[PDB]
Structures are given as C-alpha cells and as structure tokens.
Amino acid sequence: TIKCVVVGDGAVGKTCLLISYTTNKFPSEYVPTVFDNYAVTVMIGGEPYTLGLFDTAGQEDYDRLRPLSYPQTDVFLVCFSVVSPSSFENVKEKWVPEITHHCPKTPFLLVGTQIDLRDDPSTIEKLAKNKQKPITPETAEKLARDLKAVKYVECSALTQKGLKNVFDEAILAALEP
Amino acid sequence: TIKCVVVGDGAVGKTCLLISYTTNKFPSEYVPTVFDNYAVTVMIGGEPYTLGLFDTAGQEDYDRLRPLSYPQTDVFLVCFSVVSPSSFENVKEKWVPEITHHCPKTPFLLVGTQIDLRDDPSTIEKLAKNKQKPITPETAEKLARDLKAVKYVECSALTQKGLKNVFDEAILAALE
Amino acid sequence: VNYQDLEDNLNLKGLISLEDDRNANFESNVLKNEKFLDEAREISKKSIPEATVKQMSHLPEFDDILTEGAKKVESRINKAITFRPSVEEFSEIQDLVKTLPKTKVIEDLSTKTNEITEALAATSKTIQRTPELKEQLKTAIEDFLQNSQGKPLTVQMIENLNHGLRPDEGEGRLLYKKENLTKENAVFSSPEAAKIQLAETVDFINRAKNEGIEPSVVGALVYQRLIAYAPFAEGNGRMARVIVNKILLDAGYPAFTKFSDEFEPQIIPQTKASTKSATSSEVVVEFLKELAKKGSKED
Amino acid sequence: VNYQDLEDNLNLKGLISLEDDRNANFESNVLKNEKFLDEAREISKKSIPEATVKQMSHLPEFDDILTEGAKKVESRINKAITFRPSVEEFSEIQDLVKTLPKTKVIEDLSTKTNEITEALAATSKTIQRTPELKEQLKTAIEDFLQNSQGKPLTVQMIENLNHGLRPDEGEGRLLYKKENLTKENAVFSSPEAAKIQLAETVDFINRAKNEGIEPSVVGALVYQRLIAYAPFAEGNGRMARVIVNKILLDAGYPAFTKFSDEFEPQIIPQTKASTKSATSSEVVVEFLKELAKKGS
Numbered sequence A: 001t002i003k004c005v006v007v008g009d010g011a012v013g014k015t016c017l018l019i020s021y022t023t024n025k026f027p028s029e030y031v032p033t034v035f036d037n038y039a040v041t042v043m044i045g046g047e048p049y050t051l052g053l054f055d056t057a058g059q060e061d062y063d064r065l066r067p068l069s070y071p072q073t074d075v076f077l078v079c080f081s082v083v084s085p086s087s088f089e090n091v092k093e094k095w096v097p098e099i100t101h102h103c104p105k106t107p108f109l110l111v112g113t114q115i116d117l118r119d120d121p122s123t124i125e126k127l128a129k130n131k132q133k134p135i136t137p138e139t140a141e142k143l144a145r146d147l148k149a150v151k152y153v154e155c156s157a158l159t160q161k162g163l164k165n166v167f168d169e170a171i172l173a174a175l176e177p
Numbered sequence B: 001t002i003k004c005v006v007v008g009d010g011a012v013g014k015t016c017l018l019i020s021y022t023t024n025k026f027p028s029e030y031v032p033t034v035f036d037n038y039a040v041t042v043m044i045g046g047e048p049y050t051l052g053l054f055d056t057a058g059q060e061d062y063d064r065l066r067p068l069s070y071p072q073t074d075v076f077l078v079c080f081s082v083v084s085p086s087s088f089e090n091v092k093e094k095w096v097p098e099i100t101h102h103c104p105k106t107p108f109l110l111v112g113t114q115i116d117l118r119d120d121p122s123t124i125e126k127l128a129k130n131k132q133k134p135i136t137p138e139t140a141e142k143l144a145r146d147l148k149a150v151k152y153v154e155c156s157a158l159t160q161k162g163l164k165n166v167f168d169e170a171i172l173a174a175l176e
Numbered sequence C: 001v002n003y004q005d006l007e008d009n010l011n012l013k014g015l016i017s018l019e020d021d022r023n024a025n026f027e028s029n030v031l032k033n034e035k036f037l038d039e040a041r042e043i044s045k046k047s048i049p050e051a052t053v054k055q056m057s058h059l060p061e062f063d064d065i066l067t068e069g070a071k072k073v074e075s076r077i078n079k080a081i082t083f084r085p086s087v088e089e090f091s092e093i094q095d096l097v098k099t100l101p102k103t104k105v106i107e108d109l110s111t112k113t114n115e116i117t118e119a120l121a122a123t124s125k126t127i128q129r130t131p132e133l134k135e136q137l138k139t140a141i142e143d144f145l146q147n148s149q150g151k152p153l154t155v156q157m158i159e160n161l162n163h164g165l166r167p168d169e170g171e172g173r174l175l176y177k178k179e180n181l182t183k184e185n186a187v188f189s190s191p192e193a194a195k196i197q198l199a200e201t202v203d204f205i206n207r208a209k210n211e212g213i214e215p216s217v218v219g220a221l222v223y224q225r226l227i228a229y230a231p232f233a234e235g236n237g238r239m240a241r242v243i244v245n246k247i248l249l250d251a252g253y254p255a256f257t258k259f260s261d262e263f264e265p266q267i268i269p270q271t272k273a274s275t276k277s278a279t280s281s282e283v284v285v286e287f288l289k290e291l292a293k294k295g296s297k298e299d
Numbered sequence D: 001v002n003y004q005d006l007e008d009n010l011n012l013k014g015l016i017s018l019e020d021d022r023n024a025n026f027e028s029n030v031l032k033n034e035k036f037l038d039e040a041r042e043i044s045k046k047s048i049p050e051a052t053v054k055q056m057s058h059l060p061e062f063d064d065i066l067t068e069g070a071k072k073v074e075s076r077i078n079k080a081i082t083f084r085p086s087v088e089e090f091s092e093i094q095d096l097v098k099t100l101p102k103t104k105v106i107e108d109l110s111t112k113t114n115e116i117t118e119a120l121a122a123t124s125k126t127i128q129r130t131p132e133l134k135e136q137l138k139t140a141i142e143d144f145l146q147n148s149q150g151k152p153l154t155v156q157m158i159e160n161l162n163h164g165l166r167p168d169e170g171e172g173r174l175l176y177k178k179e180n181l182t183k184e185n186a187v188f189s190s191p192e193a194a195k196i197q198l199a200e201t202v203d204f205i206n207r208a209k210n211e212g213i214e215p216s217v218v219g220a221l222v223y224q225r226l227i228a229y230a231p232f233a234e235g236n237g238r239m240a241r242v243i244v245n246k247i248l249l250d251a252g253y254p255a256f257t258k259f260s261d262e263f264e265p266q267i268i269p270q271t272k273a274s275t276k277s278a279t280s281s282e283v284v285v286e287f288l289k290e291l292a293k294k295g296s
C-alpha cells in the first residue's frame, strides 16, 4: 500500500476529487465531510500499485486530531482552490509547515483544484469585485519550488481534467529516495 | 480479487477463524457476530494473490438476507465443527444445497473447524454421554467427494494449526 | 440583555425564556451525551493507525482529542441558531410582524396542501418540469397535514413526511444520514446530534404553540435549525419548508420559500472562510422581511 | 393464561401486567423504530456488492429482506426475557420467596459496597488475585450506590457505573458497543435495540419499586434482560450484577453471583443449536433457588 493523504482548507474540494477519481463520477448531491479511506489499484508502466487514499478535515477545529492520521504516510496532496486565494495562502502559512513538522522526509504535491471555475464568468467577476483573481499556473509552480514540492499539478473534479495525472504523480513521488 | 465467502452453522467458529487468520491472534474476548469483509495478500509460488474474505450469519433468521452477498463469489468455505455432528449434517442438508442454488458453478471447500477440541476432556465426555462422536477426517473426506467439494481441509482457530493452509487451498480452488 | 420593560404582544419573552433553558442544557444534552461522544470517538479513530491509537490510549487527554472537533462544530451551530436578540431587534421584530400579510379566513386542507406544494415548486426547476414528482410530493404534504392536524407534532410524523418527500429514491435507503454529510460549503450537525435536537425542535414547536408564541417567529427559527441539523440522508430542505409552512399557513400567513442566494449561506455555518455569518435574530428579521414581500409586486 | 384468582402476595399480577404492556408495545418501540431499522439496513448492505444493491433497490421486497433477520433476533430475545409464568411457576415463586434469607434491618451503604464487591470477586479469579483492580471496582460500586440512593435510577448512572467497572481499559474507548458482538455462543441485542431496551429496563426498575413488586423477582428479571441486551462494549456482566444486587440488598436479600455453568447459557438465546433454552419464569425460579442457598 502507498499511503496518500489529502490535506488543505475546507471547501477546496478534497472530498469531491477523491470521489470523482475513485468512482469516475463527480458527486452532485450530498458528500461526506471526510471520505472513508479507500484503496484502489493503479497501473504505472505495466506495474500494479495499491494506492491508499485518506481524506482529512482541514478546519482549525481538527488541528490536534488530524495529524494522528499522518503516521506512515508515503505522499501528501496539499490542495488549494485556484479560485480561492486564501486557500492558496494557507498552503504556505499552515499546510506545508504542518506536514513537514510531522513528516519532514515525506514527499508532497501541490494540487490546484476546481480549475473549471477559472472559466466561470460569475466566479471571476466575484473575485474581481473583491480585487482578487484566480491563481495562475505560473505563481503556483513558483510556490511549489519555493516550498520544495515534488511538483505542481492541477485538476477539476467536475470535468475530471488532470484528475488521473494527479494520482499518477502522487504514486511516482512516493516511489523515491 | 479472489472473493472467499465463509458459511456454516452458528458457533462453528466462522468469525474466529477469519480473525485468527488475519491478525495471527485468536480473539479471547468479544467478537463480531459477522466479521467485516477484509482483503489480504496471500503468496503462492512467489506470486501475490488478493483474497477478499467475507463472513456470514449462519442462523436461520438470516436465510433471506445471506445469499445477497453471494454474487461474484469465487470460492466458498463450508464450515462445520469437528465436534458438532449437527453442524456436519447441515453441510449436506443446508449449506451445499444453499450455495449450489444461490451461487451455481462456484467451487467450495469443506472445512472442519475447532480440531483442538477433539482432545478436550469436557467436549469428548459430553459427546460420548450423548452416544455421539467427533467427525473423523475420513468421513469428512467422503462427504466432500460425495458433495463434489474441491477437497476437505480442517483447522483450529485457537492453535492456528492448519489455518494458513485452508486459505491456501481456497485460492487454488478458485484458480483451478 | 433585559427585555422586561419592552413592548411585547408576540410572547417573544416566553420564547426567549424557552431558548435560554435549551441553550443552558445544551452542553449536558448534546456535548456530554455519550452516544454523541461514542459517535465522535468512532469517527475520529477510523483514520488513526492501529499502533498510534494504542500509544495514545495511555494519554489522559486522548478522549478530548477524539471529541473536541465534533463538539466545536455542534457548539458553532447552536450559537448560530440560538435566539437572543438585542433590544433593537426585539422591537423591530414586534413592528415587522404587524406588516405580515395575514388572512382570517381559515383555509382547508387541500388549499393548504396546494399552497405548500406550489411553494416547494417555486424554487425547484425539477418539480416544475416533472408533474409525477410534484403530484407525489403533494400527496406526502397532504398526508402530513392530515396526520398532524389538531395534534402535537411527533418525530414519527416527521420521519413519515421526510420519506414521503423522497419518492425517486428506490428501496432499502436509510432514512437518517449515517455520516457527516455536506454540500455547497454547508456545515450540518452530526447524525446523533441532529437526532437529539430534532426531538428538541419538536418539543419546541409544540411548546411554542401552547404558550401562544408568534408563529411567524416560530417558523423562522424552525426553518433555520431544522436545516442546520439536517438529520435525514435526503430531503431535509423540503421537510423543513413543509413543517415551517404548516406553522405559517395555520396562522394565516403566506408560504415561505427560500432566502436570497446571497443571504441563505449566512444562516448556517460554512466550510468557506469568506462566507459571512448571520445571527439567529438577524435570520428572523430577514425571514420576516421575505415573508412580508410574498404578495408584493416583486412577489 | 389468566392469573386473576391466584394466591399472590408478591404483586406478581402487577408485574405481569407491566410485562404485557411492554410486550404489546415491543414491535412499535423496537421492531418499527426507524433508528433500529436504519442500523439493520446499514449492517446488511455492508456485505452486499454495490451493483447488487442497485438492482435490489428496484424490488419491493428489498427493505424487508434487509431488516428481517435483525428483527427476528430481537423478537427471539424478547420472547426469552418476557415474564409470563405458568400457574405452577407462579405458585412456586410464591413458595420460594418465603424461603429467602432476608434481614429486617437494611445494611448501610458501606456494608452494601463491600457485599457487592465480594459478590463480584466470588466468580472472578482475576479480581481475587488483583487487589488494585478489586479496589477500583469497589470505588465504582460505592459511587454508584451513592448517586442512585433514594433517587430514580437513570441511564446516566448506569453509564457512569459501566465505565467505573472498566478500569484497566485505556483512554478513548467506546462506552456502548458499535456492532453486533458475541462470545461463548451468546446472542445479544443489536446496539440500538440494546439502548432502547436499557431505557425500558431502567423505567421497569423504577416502576416495579413504586408498585412494591417483589424485589427478588425484579432482581431476577433485570439480571436476565440486562445481560441479554448487553448495551455496552464491555463490563455488561459486572454492571448487571451490581444493579441487581442493589435491588436485592435494598430489600434485605443476600447478593447474587452467577447461575451454574450448566444453566447460565440457557438464560439467553445461543448461536449453538444444542444448548437448552429456559423461559423467563424458569430463569426466575432458578434465580430464587440459587438465592435461597446463600446463607449456607
């Protein structure tokens, strides 16, 4: 089993991406706050791999509890919504310090989510009215190298775009020194 | 995944043998009536096999529900206690007709359980006083071939004697 | 806050007294309820590796680590729904209620049924385009209205209403939700907490009616908390609106639908940091304003 | 069976009435209780492939298939514990109660604490050899008697009692059991059914005392059903015995320990087909016989 732990702020779409990836369907109704941990078989270059997927609760309420799921993690997924700059800022302020403190040698991916919303007129107009803008791949990739992520990947759980690659890269990160 | 479903009368040790196998420890306290289905990696000839383990409720109350778990079963474990003649008779009267009706063309093993109890002074005293006796491997083997089981195996969840081999045979039965 | 010297013809003071008592016993009834705690304990342990659990088991603070997060969620919800208005709000509510469209002629069961059905449909494209669905919901509403008519509300009536409001589901579905669920950044109660307080909301509805508490305000509070609790796997929104509108139509008030797209996410806590949060009494005020617009030009 | 014209100084008739009403409302309160049903539905679905669940959801019989087994278990348990004696058993119970050792002055709380603690140790080698464990249980017992004395019994007291009787446990354990559990071929109530009927048993303890129903018989019945329901993850045996012995000692009776090794498995339904089954009233009679021996 390769243990993959998904972390990040609330509402960035951690649960939906795990469900979308494991079911091949974007969930449109109710959804667990925390996806029960689930194992899936992934084929990488003819070889089979068992990916163990763990969801987390990102809120401050669970600061003391959440890391108790970190032991023997093989790779982290630090997620932020590309249309939520505050979740992007928390990548640096909260999430990477938290995982490097508990698992300093464990590799991590920087994951942009909900990229379909960069092409959502209502979404951008609402950011602009707040003098904000979506996160670009340029700035995210800068952050990934400044914070020593393995790399930056982005996806949409809704369209499944980039979704498969996220977890392929998660596995490749975990099979390393 | 090779799906293995464990059936048989209540109290034959269906749950305890699954737990003893997966944890390498015989449970001494409370135990689930029905062990939650659990996957395990089993090595046969240097090759990993993924074995899906499914427990059931053996009692008659759950007769209507039980077969609902049978779809895509690869191999059945039909269990009886070697010191329970009634559980052994029900192999023929109930369990193999149940799985052949509700899951045809699916291989099954005949599994004798709690073999440590053939050496238990209290168990054997009781059987003898009721003019009964434990099932010998020989009459079990005969039943197995009569009922077209792949083969007869037996084990003890308490001592783990023969326990590993049971699930080794189950995988072979599913691969043959 | 003291309301003793304020004008009140809605028995708002009796309502506030009722809220004071429930809020006071909230810690004992919910936060310290062992079923709720066990539910939290089991939820928390699922993700924790077996060996870590065992190393934590010797720590005096282990139980609190297991449960603190779940308790903070219920507390945040209770804070959002608990009615404790400012002097000014107390007075504005008094004034706002006099402005409500209110009929004295008592509608009959089929008329109430139709008004509640149309209210449901008003915010639902699916119901509008699907007569089979609309007719099914109408039957459910009619059944609930006829069973609760002249009687104290029971949780059983609600269970049946919720089931009736979930016709497209299939067989063997769970009535209550089995886990913490969310949609659209919403924060709802845990399954056990939602059940406990569903029961309290029923007692509240019955008590409020017996004490002659203004139904338009009762409806507002019930709308907020039933949605915040969301005990069932599905149809919590429909169920809340039917119960609320029974309360309103029985008093001669118009049917409520929803809040605006902007204000609705302010009535319960959200998982989105940016989303604003309204107090219970602010929700009542807004509820009354929306209800007052019901026959208007904007309608 | 009508008991109307039978000799009775134990208010057995009032007790039977109580039981008739609980039994008459059993299907409503337990079998049709939606939380219990949801529990059954979830348990059943765990072993079913999702695609099969999808198929079954189109069939009208699916929900009943889901809930049939769980409901039959609770009915079998309720059948075993519901007190409904024959005329012979009725009369025999009238006789047995008179042979029971019974002090006219009731011992104080500290004396009760000790007798209940000693009764617990009497059937347990582990408590006999481990003074620290025994002393911990003593404290929990004293605490329980302290808070229950002269008050209506509550579910909360029992939760506190159960926890106190589970001392070597570690932190963060579940109080109630989370799944159907068993040991020694036992059949216990489901978690939700056990919770519903723990509350009922509590109310039964309070109602029976108010009606002045013979405490030794109340004790017998409480012993059987609390053990049958077994709501907690652990310590259901110790807990039931402490509660029953509060009931007995309050009336001046001696403490109960256990039934014989041969009779104990008869008092609740078993997963083993060969084990004999005893009716509620047969359990009461045997309980009384065991209790009457305590002096010697």
Ligand SMILES: Nc1nc2c(ncn2[C@@H]2O[C@H](COP(=O)(O)OP(=O)(O)O)[C@@H](O)[C@H]2O)c(=O)[nH]1
Residues within 6 Å of the ligand: A008, A009, A010, A011, A012, A013, A014, A015, A016, A017, A031, A032, A033, A113, A114, A115, A116, A117, A155, A156, A157, A158, A159, C182, C183, C184, C185, C271
């Ligand atoms: N448009 C869009 N919405 C998404 C996507 N992923 C999640 N969401 C929405 O974001 C909200 C919260 O998602 P959730 O998975 O519960 O976030 P979490 O709290 O981090 O687990 C839900 O309303 C989802 O429908 C996405 O890729 N695209």
Ligand SMILES: Nc1nc2c(ncn2[C@@H]2O[C@H](COP(=O)(O)OP(=O)(O)O)[C@@H](O)[C@H]2O)c(=O)[nH]1
Residues within 6 Å of the ligand: B008, B009, B010, B011, B012, B013, B014, B015, B016, B017, B031, B033, B058, B113, B114, B115, B116, B117, B155, B156, B157, B158, B159, D182, D183, D184, D185, D271
């Ligand atoms: N001596 C012995 N006892 C066993 C063995 N397996 C199970 N048991 C006992 O049989 C009883 C019931 O076992 P269980 O697994 O619950 O049977 P099930 O109803 O078929 O699941 C328990 O009290 C166990 O202690 C075994 O291999 N040897």
Ligand SMILES: *P(=O)(O)OC[C@H]1O[C@@H](n2cnc3c(N)ncnc32)[C@H](O)[C@@H]1O
Residues within 6 Å of the ligand: C183, C184, C185, C186, C187, C227, C233, C234, C235, C236, C237, C238, C264, C265, C266, C267, C268, C270
């Ligand atoms: P479920 O479909 O049973 O109920 C839907 C109703 O829940 C309320 N609701 C959903 N999402 C939110 C948010 N983010 N904020 C406030 N209220 C919410 C609505 O009343 C739905 O109709």
Ligand SMILES: *P(=O)(O)OC[C@H]1O[C@@H](n2cnc3c(N)ncnc32)[C@H](O)[C@@H]1O
Residues within 6 Å of the ligand: D183, D184, D185, D186, D187, D227, D230, D232, D233, D234, D235, D236, D237, D238, D264, D265, D266, D267, D268, D270
């Ligand atoms: P758990 O350890 O909480 O409770 C133990 C008590 O359960 C009763 N008990 C166990 N096993 C059986 C069987 N097979 N039949 C009847 N009663 C049983 C005993 O009272 C234990 O003390």
Ligand SMILES: [Mg+2]
Residues within 6 Å of the ligand: A014, A015, A016, A032, A033, A034, A035, A055, A056
């Ligand atoms: Mg989530």
Ligand SMILES: [Mg+2]
Residues within 6 Å of the ligand: B014, B015, B016, B032, B033, B034, B035, B055, B056
């Ligand atoms: Mg079992």
